[PDB]
Write a protein that binds this ligand. Structure first.
Ligand code: SAH
Length: 263
């Protein structure tokens, strides 16, 4: 585990979290508790989910100085977040859990998250439509939240040192912006189309038709009829997957869902 030892980056993450004494913060991972302490100082209360019980000495020492820290010993991928009341998440994430934890947190919901990722992962998260790092992860995150890189973090900020850069990413959930009709279908639709990101949406959906539980002949006919509903759909499905904006992907999947339900 690479612990964050540079207080300048701790400060940047905390400042970006815009904390007040009315905020309740969830932290994933304790480390030496350098971030934990700053959260404790500034927030109403901090929950720390930590998998490694050997780190108890840091926890015990922290509770002697701060009365508003609660440790939950366990695996953050296993813990039922629904049973916790918090409005913000601030963490130097274990990079191996980056993807599942991000969606688990977004599913649970929060006002704002400020999270450390590997830099490449963060770049994919915030990638603009039609660019080389734009992909399924970009759309899955941006369709549900506004995301931005707050700072690039060098290996020297950590001990022991990682091999690559990290990034602080700010996440502000945004349900209204795009409005996903059906979460399950949208997830299936995203999987199908980004299995073939350089192909047209049409050709991607035919190739990955089994991801939506249709055979290739059914899907081809479906899209013939779907294309006949309006000219906007025609232009969208003929375009390359990675070139569609998040807005257009959400709208397209919404319309396709409705089309399929009526069929
Ligand atoms: N699945 C998991 N659930 C909860 N904690 C985990 C975890 N996997 C790793 N951890 C813990 O998360 C921490 C990651 S290193 C980050 C430590 C600290 N936040 C800092 O900035 O220095 C370690 O304490 C490690 O034991």
């Amino acid at each position: 585990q690479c612990f964050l030892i540079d207080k300048n980056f701790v400060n940047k993450a905390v400042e970006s979290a815009n904390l007040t004494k009315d905020d309740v913060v969830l932290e994933i991972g304790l480390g030496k508790g350098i971030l934990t302490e700053e959260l404790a100082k500034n927030a109403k209360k901090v929950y720390v989910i930590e998998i490694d019980k050997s780190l108890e000495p840091y926890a015990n020492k922290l509770k002697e100085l701060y009365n508003n820290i609660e440790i939950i010993w366990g695996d953050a991928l296993k813990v039922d977040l629904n049973k916790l009341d918090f409005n913000k998440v601030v963490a130097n994430l274990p990079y191996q859990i980056s993807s599942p934890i991000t969606f688990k947190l977004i599913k649970r919901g929060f006002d704002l998250a400020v999270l450390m990722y590997q830099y490449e992962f963060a770049k994919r998260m915030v990638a603009a439509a039609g660019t080389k790092d734009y992909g399924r992860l970009s759309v899955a995150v941006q369709s549900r939240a506004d995301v931005e890189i707050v700072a690039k973090v060098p290996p020297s900020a950590f001990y022991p040192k990682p091999k690559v850069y990290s990034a602080i990413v700010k996440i502000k959930p945004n349900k209204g912006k795009y409005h996903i009709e059906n979460e399950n279908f949208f997830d299936d639709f995203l999987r199908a189309i980004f299995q073939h990101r350089n192909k047209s949406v049409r050709k991607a959906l035919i190739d990955s038709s089994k991801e939506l539980n249709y055979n290739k002949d059914e899907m081809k006919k479906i899209l013939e009829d779907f294309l006949n509903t309006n000219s906007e759909i025609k232009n969208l499905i003929n375009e390359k997957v990675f070139k569609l904006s998040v807005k257009d992907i959400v709208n397209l999947s919404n319309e396709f869902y409705r089309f399929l339900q009526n069929r």
